Symmetry: D6
Subunit: 99 residues, 12 copies
């Protein structure tokens, strides 16, 4: 299951990115990551094609935000299982209860 | 229920943004978010039209603050339910006890 | 009860701001807030006129600090009750035991 | 057992770095480290030659990321045991359960 | 009892500031404060004249540090009791056990 | 017992600094400190002459790191006991179990 | 009015059955679960007075049928004073709210 | 003077009834709830001496009527020494203050 | 439907045997372990109703064979109400999910 | 010398009365309160040996008068070894220090 | 196969002796220690089945010789299901791994 | 060799006396204090075997003289396996180290 990420500078924009992503295709927002310098990432999981659709929409929508800025984005089609155990890209408890 | 966000650089300004928002219309301040680089966001919930009124007032009032600066703002009319589970835009425990 | 805020860049200056505020008038320092980028805020509560007196003194005294810098300030005469529940402007446990 | 590190500015890029590293050779991603200013490090362990292979791939892949930036990298062939006890380069609980 | 503060950019320098302060006069280092942007403060308590001696020595010694930088300093002769309850300038548990 | 400190900008470099320090002479790495703005410090303890040897090696090795940068360094020959109680320069639990 | 209903059991299995029988028998929300020792645990439900009475009755009959089941005490409070919400686990949690 | 009133029960339901009966019978504030094992739990109220006496009496009569209810001990302290506030859960909390 | 199965024992060793026998005897997942005092502990499993019945039966037979083993109570809930998931440790955890 | 005095009760109300009677009967400071199960709780006071003896005696007489009161054990240590301070809740806390 | 061995005692001293006797009598690793109330505590060891049997036997003989020693229950599981690792303290910890 | 000595009491006051008598009677360090329920608590000391024997003996005689004192179990382990240090509170803490 692919992973999609949009990193913005600013919180409002990251929230819009996430909203646009889950609305554009069949992906689950699994988390959000702060790393400082105003950089925040929203992470979604789903089929590669769903994730591609969601990230493209997420980027477009975030850039429309008043003062919105997208810093980086990336999609990994088949993330190695090891990552699930170290980085915050896994379906969380709260998350799978929403499903 | 819509979500409204004002991100400022500086705490005093974000506090004013929040005060102005809840006073301008029928919205509930549900939280506050720090992301570093002096960037803080206040988040309100309510009817889209209430939120529109509150954000416009929040922006005007924050800009009047001595040294106040607004970095970004955004309103999402119908935030996807998935967001409530990942991002800090949900009515909190403390919050719904105030209601 | 009004809320007064002085945000400085630097800790020594914020400590002086707070000392000057509680000494200048009848206000209670209720808290302190860090938001990154060296930005820290001290928050006091009291009658609007007391708070006005305290913030003016706090600003003057903070600017006298060696390397002191004031970034922003603001006073809200009647902060909405909703804020008390979300933002760190409320009388705390430790605080009301000092009173 | 060698330690390999790639530090990026941006989260998406660090996630790609990690994915590329564990896919390129026989290394275990043991952790991730945030230090502010958007600087994040992913850490892998394995035979020196595996780690060399993984870091080279991790760097190439991270630089291909949209808005990806690599700040620093380093490999230590035989890290002193003392480090395992202070710095986050050790196999963690969650990690060795994945193995 | 007076409070003395030296804020540096850099940790090594703040550690030297503290060492120099407690060695120069009869003051107790009561704490250390991080506020981001590399800004850290060391706080001492003691008689105003002891604190004056310690801060002057602390500044001189910190500036001798390789890459040492002092950002701000301040002394408050009779800090208001209210501050003890909000800001980290109080004798701590660990601290008074050293005494 | 002397204290030695190397502060870098970047995590990989600080890890190398630490490795080089404990390998160059008879010192114990006792901790690591993050203060933001990418500034991290590694702290060692040992005889002044051991610490001098370790810091010199730590600096040389950190500067060889790809993208490595050393911001500041310092050695305190006889750190005042008060510091042990406030600043993170003390032998920790985990640490003395390694010994 | 919105009553609170409580069933206390000796043993966890029996208390889980009480809870399941309570929310199934009537229009009530399980809001809490309280451990106090001696194998005594309480499930707390909220709802209309008549709904809570229906559910507590169902809860008790079912719990007593559990193998090694044992009900210690029960009680229904019709109009719980607001003060209680703030001290005891009878209040709704945002957790059980989202649901 | 401002007395403290305590009812200790065996069982949680009975202690919740004690609390509800206490704050309802007189001008007192429930400030705490204390678990100590063996199924023993205490509700603590604050108020004038005469108010606390009225409420403790109501509390006990009501608690004994709870199904499987059982009161273990009670006590009213008329002028609790200030020292106690700082060690025991008899003090008001900002939680119960806001209310 | 997806039932929940619970075995409560007196003693930890016996409860660990119950759990091991349960997941081995049928298609069930151990999702929780609950301590409530008096030496009473519960293991909770999730699975189809028929699978959970098979496993609880195996669990009980095995637990009673443990040296100093002792089963206090057991229960199977066929269709646990969703409300319970949110209050009690019967829900899957991302921990047991990854597995 | 500075002795430590302890009264252990069965029940919380009685232990709160012990504490109140102790600090009122003599020049002692309540520094701790210890829960260990089976409804056993201890109040610990510090002071001169003769002061602690006066207070423990008062404490016991008063505690035994509490409704459902019960004193389990008491003890006075005249010169408690410094080692104990560091392991047990007999030491002053900055909490009780500020007072 | 890698079995798990458990000795549960009444009393801590006896459980510490059990653990010491177990790891000394055979090739096993103490991985956990479990408190569940009523003075019942368990030590858990991991190792080959034959090694764990040797150690549990040694553990029990030694524990029964402890003054006021008392063994409540014991059990050896030869092939503990992987599910258990994720719910119970039978798994290795990085703590006991480093050793 | 460096033995561990343990005295377990019923009641806290008696356990505090045991500890005080132990460190006073011989060259031992109190390193821990363990609560396990049923009013059972253990004090743990470290030292030479002969020193620990002297202290445990003193500890027991003194504890039995405590009003309402009661010793449940004791034990001395001459050469505690290193594995134990990592699982149980018999290890020195940096807390008791600094002293």
């Amino acid at each position: 299951i692919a992973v999609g990420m949009i990193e913005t500078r600013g919180f409002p924009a990251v929230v819009e990115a996430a909203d646009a992503m889950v609305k554009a295709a069949r992906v689950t927002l699994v988390g959000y990551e702060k790393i400082g310098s105003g950089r925040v990432t929203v992470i979604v999981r789903g089929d590669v094609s769903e994730v591609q659709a969601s990230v493209a929409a997420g980027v477009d929508s975030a850039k429309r935000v008043n003062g919105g800025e997208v810093l980086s984005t990336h999609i990994i089609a088949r993330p190695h299982e090891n990552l699930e155990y170290v980085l915050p890209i896994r379906y969380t408890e709260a998350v799978e209860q929403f499903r």
